[PDB]
Structure 1
Amino acid sequence: EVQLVESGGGLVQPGGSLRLSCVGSGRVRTINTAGWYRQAPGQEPEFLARITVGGTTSYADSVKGRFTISRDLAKSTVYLQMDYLKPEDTAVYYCNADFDFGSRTAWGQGTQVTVSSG
């Protein structure tokens, strides 16, 4: 059993940066990959970034060059560094983790990211 706790959302101006954290607890040794997703109101979730235990990363085209996914195995934490945020990036961001040989999946509770000048 794996649980995911997220943090780091909030308000940010266009062009600003935020870092999201995805802290894993439980049988974290079984986690194979972890990914970042986002969902806007009334839309399907959108894949953003993926990372394996070895550190291999994969990105969606909408965030390449701006977002960086990383993982700290000692802390069981997956990070999403989001640079040059745009109003289009406003959504609730979720992290997932595939564990038990990629046969189980756990989702974080989500964190709201709003890109606005006010």
Structure 2
Amino acid sequence: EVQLVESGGGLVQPGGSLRLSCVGSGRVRTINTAGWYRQAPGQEPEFLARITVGGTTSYADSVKGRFTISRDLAKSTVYLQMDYLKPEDTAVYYCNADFDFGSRTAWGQGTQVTVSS
């Protein structure tokens, strides 16, 4: 069993930046990949970025060149560095983790990001 807890987020101006954290607890060494997703108002959740234990990353086009995903294995924490922020980035941001040889999935609780002036 794996639990994910998110922190960071809140209100930021366009052009600002924020860092989100996704802290894993439990059997974290069984985690294979972790990803970030977001759910904008009125829309379904959308994939943003993924990272492997080895640190290989992959990104959706909507955030390529603006958001960065990273992980700290010792802290069992995956990060989303959200830069060059646009009003259209306003959403609830979720992290997930695939574990047990990619056969199970855990989700964080979500954190609101509001980009507004």
TM category (shorter chain) comes to: over 0.9
Cα deviation 1:39-95 (Å, max 9, x = unaligned):
012211110000000000000000001100000000000000000100000000000
Q: Which structure 1 residue ranges, 5 or more long, are not aligned?
A: none
Moved over 2 A (4+): none
In structure 2, distance between residues paired with 1:101 and 1:89: 32
Cα deviation 1:78-114 (Å, max 9, x = unaligned):
0000001000000000000000000000000000000
In structure 1, distance between residues paired with 2:43 and 2:104: 24
In structure 1, distance between residues paired with 2:58 and 2:88: 21
How far 1:33 sits from its partner (Å)? 0.1
In structure 2, distance between residues paired with 1:116 and 1:7: 20
Output the TM-score relative to the length of structure 1: 0.98
Output the TM-score relative to the length of structure 2: 0.99
SS of the aligned residue for 2:97 comes to strand
In structure 2, distance between residues paired with 1:62 and 1:42: 17
Cα deviation 1:5-64 (Å, max 9, x = unaligned):
000110000000000000000000000000000001221111000000000000000000
Q: How many residues align?
A: 117
In structure 2, distance between residues paired with 1:41 and 1:30: 33
Give RMSD over aligned pairs.
Answer: 0.4
In structure 1, distance between residues paired with 2:115 and 2:70: 22
